[PDB]
Amino acid sequence: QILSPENAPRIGFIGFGAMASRMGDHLKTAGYTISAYTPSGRSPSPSVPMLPTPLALAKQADTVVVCVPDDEALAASMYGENGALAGMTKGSLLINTSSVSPEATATLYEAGQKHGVVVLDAPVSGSTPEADSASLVILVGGDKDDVARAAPIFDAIGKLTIHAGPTGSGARLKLVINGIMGAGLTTLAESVAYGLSAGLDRSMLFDALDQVAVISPHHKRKLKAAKDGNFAPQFPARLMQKDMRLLLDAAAREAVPVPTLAAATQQLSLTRRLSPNEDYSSLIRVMEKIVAN
Amino acid sequence: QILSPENAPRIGFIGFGAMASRMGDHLKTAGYTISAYTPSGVPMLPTPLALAKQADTVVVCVPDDEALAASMYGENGALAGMTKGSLLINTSSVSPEATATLYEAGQKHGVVVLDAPVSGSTPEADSASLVILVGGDKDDVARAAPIFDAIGKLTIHAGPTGSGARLKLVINGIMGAGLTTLAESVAYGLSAGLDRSMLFDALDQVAVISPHHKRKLKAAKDGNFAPQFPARLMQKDMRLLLDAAAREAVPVPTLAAATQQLSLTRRLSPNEDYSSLIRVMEKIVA
Amino acid sequence: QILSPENAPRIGFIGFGAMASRMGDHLKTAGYTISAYTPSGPMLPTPLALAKQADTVVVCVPDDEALAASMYGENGALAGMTKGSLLINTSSVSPEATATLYEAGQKHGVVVLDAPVSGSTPEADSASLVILVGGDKDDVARAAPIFDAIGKLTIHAGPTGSGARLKLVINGIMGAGLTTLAESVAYGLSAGLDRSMLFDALDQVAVISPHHKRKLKAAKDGNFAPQFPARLMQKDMRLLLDAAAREAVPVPTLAAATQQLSLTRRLSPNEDYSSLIRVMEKIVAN
Amino acid sequence: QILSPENAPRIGFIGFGAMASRMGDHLKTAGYTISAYTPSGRSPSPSVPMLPTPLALAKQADTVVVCVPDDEALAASMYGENGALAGMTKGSLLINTSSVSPEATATLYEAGQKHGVVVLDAPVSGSTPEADSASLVILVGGDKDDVARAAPIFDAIGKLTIHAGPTGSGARLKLVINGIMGAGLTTLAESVAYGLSAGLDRSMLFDALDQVAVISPHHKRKLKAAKDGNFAPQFPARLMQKDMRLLLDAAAREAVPVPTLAAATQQLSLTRRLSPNEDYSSLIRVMEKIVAN
Numbered sequence A, D: 001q002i003l004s005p006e007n008a009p010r011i012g013f014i015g016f017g018a019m020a021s022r023m024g025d026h027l028k029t030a031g032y033t034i035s036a037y038t039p040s041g042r043s044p045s046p047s048v049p050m051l052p053t054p055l056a057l058a059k060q061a062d063t064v065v066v067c068v069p070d071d072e073a074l075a076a077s078m079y080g081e082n083g084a085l086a087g088m089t090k091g092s093l094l095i096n097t098s099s100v101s102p103e104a105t106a107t108l109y110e111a112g113q114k115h116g117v118v119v120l121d122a123p124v125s126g127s128t129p130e131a132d133s134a135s136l137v138i139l140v141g142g143d144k145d146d147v148a149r150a151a152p153i154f155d156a157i158g159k160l161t162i163h164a165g166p167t168g169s170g171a172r173l174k175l176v177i178n179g180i181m182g183a184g185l186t187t188l189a190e191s192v193a194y195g196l197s198a199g200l201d202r203s204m205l206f207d208a209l210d211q212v213a214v215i216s217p218h219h220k221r222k223l224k225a226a227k228d229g230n231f232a233p234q235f236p237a238r239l240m241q242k243d244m245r246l247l248l249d250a251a252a253r254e255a256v257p258v259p260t261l262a263a264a265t266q267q268l269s270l271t272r273r274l275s276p277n278e279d280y281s282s283l284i285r286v287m288e289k290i291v292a293n
Numbered sequence B: 001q002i003l004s005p006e007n008a009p010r011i012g013f014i015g016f017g018a019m020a021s022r023m024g025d026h027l028k029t030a031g032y033t034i035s036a037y038t039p040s041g042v043p044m045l046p047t048p049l050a051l052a053k054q055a056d057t058v059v060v061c062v063p064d065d066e067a068l069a070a071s072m073y074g075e076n077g078a079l080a081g082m083t084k085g086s087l088l089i090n091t092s093s094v095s096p097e098a099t100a101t102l103y104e105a106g107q108k109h110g111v112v113v114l115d116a117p118v119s120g121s122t123p124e125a126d127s128a129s130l131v132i133l134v135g136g137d138k139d140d141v142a143r144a145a146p147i148f149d150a151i152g153k154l155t156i157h158a159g160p161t162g163s164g165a166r167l168k169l170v171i172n173g174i175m176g177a178g179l180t181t182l183a184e185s186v187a188y189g190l191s192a193g194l195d196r197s198m199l200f201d202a203l204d205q206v207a208v209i210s211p212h213h214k215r216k217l218k219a220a221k222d223g224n225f226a227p228q229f230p231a232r233l234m235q236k237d238m239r240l241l242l243d244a245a246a247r248e249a250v251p252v253p254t255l256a257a258a259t260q261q262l263s264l265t266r267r268l269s270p271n272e273d274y275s276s277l278i279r280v281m282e283k284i285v286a
Numbered sequence C: 001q002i003l004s005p006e007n008a009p010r011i012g013f014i015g016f017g018a019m020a021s022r023m024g025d026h027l028k029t030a031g032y033t034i035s036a037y038t039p040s041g042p043m044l045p046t047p048l049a050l051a052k053q054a055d056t057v058v059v060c061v062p063d064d065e066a067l068a069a070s071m072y073g074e075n076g077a078l079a080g081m082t083k084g085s086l087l088i089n090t091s092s093v094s095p096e097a098t099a100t101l102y103e104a105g106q107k108h109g110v111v112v113l114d115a116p117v118s119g120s121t122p123e124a125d126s127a128s129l130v131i132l133v134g135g136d137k138d139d140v141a142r143a144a145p146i147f148d149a150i151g152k153l154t155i156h157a158g159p160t161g162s163g164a165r166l167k168l169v170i171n172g173i174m175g176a177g178l179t180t181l182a183e184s185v186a187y188g189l190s191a192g193l194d195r196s197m198l199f200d201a202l203d204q205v206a207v208i209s210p211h212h213k214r215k216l217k218a219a220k221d222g223n224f225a226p227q228f229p230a231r232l233m234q235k236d237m238r239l240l241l242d243a244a245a246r247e248a249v250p251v252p253t254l255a256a257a258t259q260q261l262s263l264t265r266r267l268s269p270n271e272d273y274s275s276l277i278r279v280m281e282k283i284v285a286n
């Protein structure tokens, strides 16, 4: 039952990008055999065999991990003529680490039920540095017994597994954390922009904010990087802004007013428009440029 | 000219509330003689003038621009009682305009005014772990160092006059919008069916919430909004920041949204901690 | 080719609510034979059965999910229409749902016009709707008798998808127009202005739209009988914000308005979306 | 008592810019004698006598009308030995048409009481085209008997006098109306921007929006001008954004949450930063440039 390497050695990835490839390396170290599918056929890992379709990927894996950008990519690869779900055996596990909507999560869970496949919604908190060090925090929705089955996989890629509740709970908890992260950055960029506009020395201001208790450790790391103009993508603007769009849609469906998060989303739209592929913290540089002019 | 206890033993306070009384206690331990004036009435003095006449250094801790003007200016105000060459230290959270007015007025009296607001609330004042954010001349900041060292753990020299007031506004914005962001995000999670205890405990484990805001979240788990920084003062600070950002023509939509949420917070409970917005949002969702 | 009563007398509706019924009254007067399907309950049992006995299909459903439920599959409307026929979608749905339906119609040889309308139940009563239509010029001309009977003006917005997009533009203006007015009134009341003075004064200024002045007059009397319910206005705002995020366009005023309309929907989903005026009055009155 | 041209022919202006000079022409037509003071000594009407100080203006005028940009300009010319109040005679009327804060309004009313001068806060709704046609709406605070005294002056410059309440009521009603105007424009600019970003033809879209009932007559006029790129200053961004700052300060003092107005203010800050002196409707062009990227 437990998906240890002896019981279920073959883990197939649907999607194999910045996070998934780093996850795969820790799973390979833990004793699993890794394979992957991507629409392009390329991936950052040359030694990982590539399968031609999602169906072919699923037909030769014991467990499937999904790590795709959005609802549309998830639907493109799980359903249809060559979709992954129909390639899985009854009683097997699908682990979705993608950041997708509650609706996409419910659709996949239901489709899994029809095929006899248990789908865990297990998005992660942490970016590429945390993927590198296997210090991700797994946010998982599903039955306790199914989370237990996946324990060795979660343990290999992360430092902590939070059982958020039944199916859908992991996806919702991820949306919560994404909103905190996105609005924390827009808040910081706007506050820095006011300080600079009001004449504060840039080097003094960036170093002073490293000393205050009201900024998170994640955002202090972004602020230090931004002092250096370093926006190499850990979490690109295109993905952060998509997560903000998903959160605002979910909050509207629940009829919860979230004006701070809604404002932050618009700032991250501007960030994405100006540079989709650099780190989402580049809004700091955007705001600096506004006040320079 | 350094303002050590042996050189300037008498520190007189204009305003003596939660923060100031805690600062005054730490300056007493450091060896200064504390006096104070408050509108309501440590030895107390009946007027700002009387307070400044019997003090070597004056420290101001008043709520807003209006209180600052009422106690600094005029024949019974603090400046009229001060002597050329002395220092006034304003720790109040006031506008850049009020700061510039007081600096210029101080100059006419031969008094150097340091704008030295602080980061940290009553727990930080209790433990003298405040961060002092001070604007002024390098040598005047040095004159005040023993006072700043008694009440805090770090003095940040932010620049010339007005730089401390501006840096406090920056930090206020981060603090206020950090709270409104957290309240809204928790509200979504609860509205989407997440178990309350699970959600509060999970958020204590993530790296994207500040230590300050994680403390607020733990208190909110218990419905505890006893004031450390009351909604009326946080919302006032947000009003000041948004006024200054408008005068500088800097678009700050996240801070503007947070300000409106803190207006609602103040309306519903002006005196409980500003983190009570967490409760306000829980009640909306419920 | 033209869908006159002579050439295409039978118009079948998918959905038949507040606007679709009023739409049908005018098409009846124009000489068409009206039939309809709704999931509740001349009424036909399925969308398939509806389409089989209609010459033109008009769709008026609340959201993307309802559109997909009734459009697709063996019991869906498309499975029952003939190549060369035309489906007119007047529903307020997403650009994504619009594109999906257009492509599905192509596979069946069916042209899908996205023709949402501007105007509410009073304009549907008087055939005063403005039709906002995307499609080929020749397909739009085919539908002209139908658009002329239900409305006063047909705007050809561009190719397929252009009507859906133009509707989203107009929905943003309508929604944020109301939230702006509700907050401005709220500030006025909180600052002590007489309520009847204030409502009457705003009726006389040139910066409020005729639509919003009619809402303001109704709100003066506390009348929020639904013409456009909060649940549907807030859904339209959700769609617009999703579309604006997909296009990466920053729209802070529209995003703020959406959050106020989420509160409005939560407090009263079925009253007119203008009830936010009352919601804000109650915030100010405590 | 009634301030008709017969009883009180002389009207002196403190400030004489775009609005005040147009008011002056209609008062001249109604049979008043016009004089003015500006700090610069010049005005768009070269046929009107200029006075060197506010004090000198008030000494030779029966009623004084004030039309200055902001609180700071108001205090500079009302107070002190050279100010207008020092030159007015007990029992005369001061009519302030400036858009200033409720605090500045209360200060000037109390100061006028000390001098025996009743101050009416009478800002106006309407811009330069309405001033040209005397279609202004006067929003006046004060006692009904003092409003009645000023009726012939209000009638010559406007089409409707709204008695908003006691002192301070006109200033507050002007703030209400300014917020509707400002956020009406930012709403329209953002909605147009979405439409353009989604591929709608520019000419089609501007013309289509002229046909819908959810845009005000004022903003329809701005939309037509914006199609033409015409942002000649009727109401410059620097003054609109100042008015929004005043409204958001007042709303914060009243603890009233106004998120749509707050969002609009930030958009008008960007507008002012990019072009302070063009019409405030230039945000439409700003947003078009953002989507052109």
Ligand SMILES: NC(=O)C1=CN([C@@H]2O[C@H](COP(=O)(O)OP(=O)(O)OC[C@H]3O[C@@H](n4cnc5c(N)ncnc54)[C@H](O)[C@@H]3O)[C@@H](O)[C@H]2O)C=CC1
Pocket (backbone or CB within 6 Å): A014, A015, A016, A017, A018, A019, A020, A037, A038, A039, A040, A043, A067, A068, A069, A070, A072, A073, A074, A076, A077, A097, A098, A099, A100, A124, A125, A126, A127, A128, A234, A235, A236, A239, A243
């Ligand atoms: N900091 C981060 O980057 C984190 C990202 N996430 C989430 O994890 C997911 C993956 O993120 P990254 O690896 O950073 O993205 P990425 O852009 O680096 O990788 C995307 C991968 O998915 C593949 N892909 C695209 N469409 C596909 C389809 N239809 N079927 C299968 N594969 C497809 C791409 O070829 C690529 O291998 C996203 O949902 C993201 O929001 C979660 C935690 C943190």
Ligand SMILES: NC(=O)C1=CN([C@@H]2O[C@H](COP(=O)(O)OP(=O)(O)OC[C@H]3O[C@@H](n4cnc5c(N)ncnc54)[C@H](O)[C@@H]3O)[C@@H](O)[C@H]2O)C=CC1
Pocket (backbone or CB within 6 Å): C014, C015, C016, C017, C018, C019, C020, C037, C038, C039, C040, C060, C061, C062, C063, C065, C066, C067, C069, C070, C090, C091, C092, C093, C116, C117, C118, C119, C120, C121, C227, C228, C229, C232, C236
């Ligand atoms: N002021 C207004 O009410 C206007 C509304 N609209 C849009 O027109 C559409 C309909 O609006 P209203 O008639 O006012 O709404 P409504 O709620 O009064 O009518 C909805 C109708 O659709 C039916 N329906 C529900 N689910 C269905 C499904 N899965 N398949 C088929 N029919 C289904 C319902 O039974 C009902 O007959 C919405 O997209 C709305 O946003 C557009 C213009 C103005």
Ligand SMILES: NC(=O)C1=CN([C@@H]2O[C@H](COP(=O)(O)OP(=O)(O)OC[C@H]3O[C@@H](n4cnc5c(N)ncnc54)[C@H](O)[C@@H]3O)[C@@H](O)[C@H]2O)C=CC1
Pocket (backbone or CB within 6 Å): D014, D015, D016, D017, D018, D019, D020, D037, D038, D039, D040, D067, D068, D069, D070, D072, D073, D074, D076, D077, D097, D098, D099, D100, D124, D125, D126, D127, D128, D234, D235, D236, D239, D243
């Ligand atoms: N569309 C508009 O332009 C409208 C403007 N208002 C308000 O009316 C006031 C004037 O606006 P505009 O005439 O358009 O501006 P403007 O800039 O054309 O006129 C300003 C006038 O005041 C004078 N001035 C400046 N500082 C002064 C001081 N300290 N003392 C005396 N005069 C001084 C200037 O020399 C000039 O004559 C402002 O408060 C504005 O917000 C009201 C309604 C509409």
